[PDB]
Design a protein around this ligand. Structure first.
Ligand SMILES: *[C@H]1C/C(=N\O)NC(=O)N1[C@H]1C[C@H](O)[C@@H](COP(=O)(O)O)O1
Ligand SMILES: *[C@H]1C/C(=N\O)NC(=O)N1[C@H]1C[C@H](O)[C@@H](COP(=O)(O)O)O1
Lengths: 287, 286
């Protein structure tokens, strides 16, 4: 067996490492404009196998996004620390966000998805009923106008850029319905191919499965489009090791309950079948 | 001589026509469709991707883009330059069908130009004074290209869900990112909905021209235009005409020369652009 989708990812890593352009004083190798397709049919789920992906973090982060939260403490208290570095006192101060409490990411993903256009005050404020709920509107359009070419969720509001700890990387999403199947395309302005991309593929494939479930559709495809696709120079050796590994079949993902609505999912609803990755890679310095 | 980038476009037409999904659509005409495509067009050596297997309305590309840049949403300003491409979506009849009863004819609502130059400003009408209002994304992108060319955040969006009830037609070409490496400016545009027959050739030219303009004013060389599409479709009414086009071996693209030094994006004029050796096959109307 050969996992063509994962091999394609490894081939894109190889193209960046061997032929990418240096961009900086910390350095990357970079290319601009890539696209990959991941088949979600038969419940196959594109969780990469050549290096273990932090699946628990994928699930918890996505449920947190869906809830509309921008409070990284809520995620950290669930033992997922991936947003703690971008919401520390030191990082916030470095962005000039001196009045934000630690944990306040500003109006990032969850807020844009559920409350677009609402003025942001802080992560603890009530936003219920405020702003444009793009996530619910997309679900509505999938069900009411599946032919639509306008089923869009944006995370990009230039008016909010001064208020965010980090501008959203995964910033534009479109859904599509054909032949009883739901597909999703996500546009990512900036992608760390080594650490971010595998996690991000899983996040949006999971979102697609969740929405397909509550819209009574079968899963189609996840299409990942990238602007600046890059690898950090310090990671090149670890990625060279990873590229020598043989991808295994992807796992399957099952949803174990008839879930009521997009806000009703729980971590325990998701079963990953036969996920057998290689271990995470750590390369000691030698020079 | 053969043109590989145009051959790729023709191959995409063939795949949609032979294998696309039949969709009903907003217009009621019906389409063959695929979801998720990407193509790259090289802008090096002044080569300019104006398709050759049919004539593209170049004068309309230029005038429409200068109009976008100005921030205008008044289709009468284009129509008065004998560019009628937005007249159908801004007639009294169409505006009334969208519930836009108080718009004067010509008012497209807060579409491309308004979003590029005035994002977030409440829209009233096409004739209101928006000078200095909203977020000038176009000028901010140019500033970032000049001052922080390595940035991974050089973005212009045309999508504001809060404005969707005010527009005649929601923007099709709706997200743009710029990128600088090795002294070359590239641009990727995301198009949620692409009429492969009529729209796409025009849209490729529009964003390639914008990339050339911005490279020129920032003293960069042009790199690539990357076109990413959501719903790429062919209207059933277009299939026969597109079958004529797919039988043609594309010719090499023209070159585009910019004829004077221009320092600000708002300073370009139509006569600054010279299209060299554009040699299209006989026109195909749809
Ligand atoms: C941004 C965040 C993400 N998911 O939330 N995925 C990513 O891969 N990233 C990476 C891209 C880049 O290396 C860095 C963001 O820095 P810039 O804002 O300068 O692009 O994080
Ligand atoms: C929208 C406008 C454009 N340039 O201005 N390019 C395009 O190709 N279009 C096409 C896409 C589609 O056929 C139609 C818009 O209808 P929807 O809003 O229903 O997608 O125009």
């Amino acid at each position: 067996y050969v996992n063509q989708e994962e091999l394609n990812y490894l081939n894109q890593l190889k193209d960046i490492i061997d032929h990418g352009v240096r961009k900086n004083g910390i350095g990357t190798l970079s290319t601009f404009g890539t696209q990959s397709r991941y088949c979600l049919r038969d419940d196959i789920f594109p969780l990469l196998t050549t290096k273990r992906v932090f699946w628990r973090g994928v699930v918890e982060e996505l449920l947190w996004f869906i809830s509309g939260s921008t409070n990284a403490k809520q995620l950290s208290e669930k033992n997922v620390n991936i947003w703690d570095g971008n919401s520390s006192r030191e990082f916030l101060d470095s962005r000039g966000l001196y009045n934000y409490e630690e944990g306040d990411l500003g109006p990032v993903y969850g807020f844009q998805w559920r409350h677009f256009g609402c003025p942001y005050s802080s992560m603890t404020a009530d936003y219920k009923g405020k702003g444009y709920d793009q996530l619910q509107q997309c679900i509505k359009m999938i069900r009411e106008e599946p032919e639509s070419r306008r089923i869009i969720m944006t995370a990009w509001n230039p008016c909010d850029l001064e208020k965010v700890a980090l501008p959203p990387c995964h910033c534009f999403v479109q859904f599509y319905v054909a032949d009883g199947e739901l597909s999703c395309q996500m546009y990512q302005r900036s992608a760390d191919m080594g650490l971010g991309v595998p996690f991000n593929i899983a996040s949006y494939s999971l979102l697609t499965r969740m929405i397909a479930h509550i819209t009574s559709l079968k899963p189609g495809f996840f299409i990942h489009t990238i602007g600046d696709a890059h690898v950090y120079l310090t990671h090149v050796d670890a990625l060279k090791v990873q590229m020598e590994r043989k991808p295994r079949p992807f796992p399957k993902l099952k949803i174990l309950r008839n879930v009521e609505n997009i806000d009703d999912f729980r971590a325990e609803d998701f079963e990953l079948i036969n996920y057998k990755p290689y271990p995470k890679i750590s390369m000691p310095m030698a020079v």
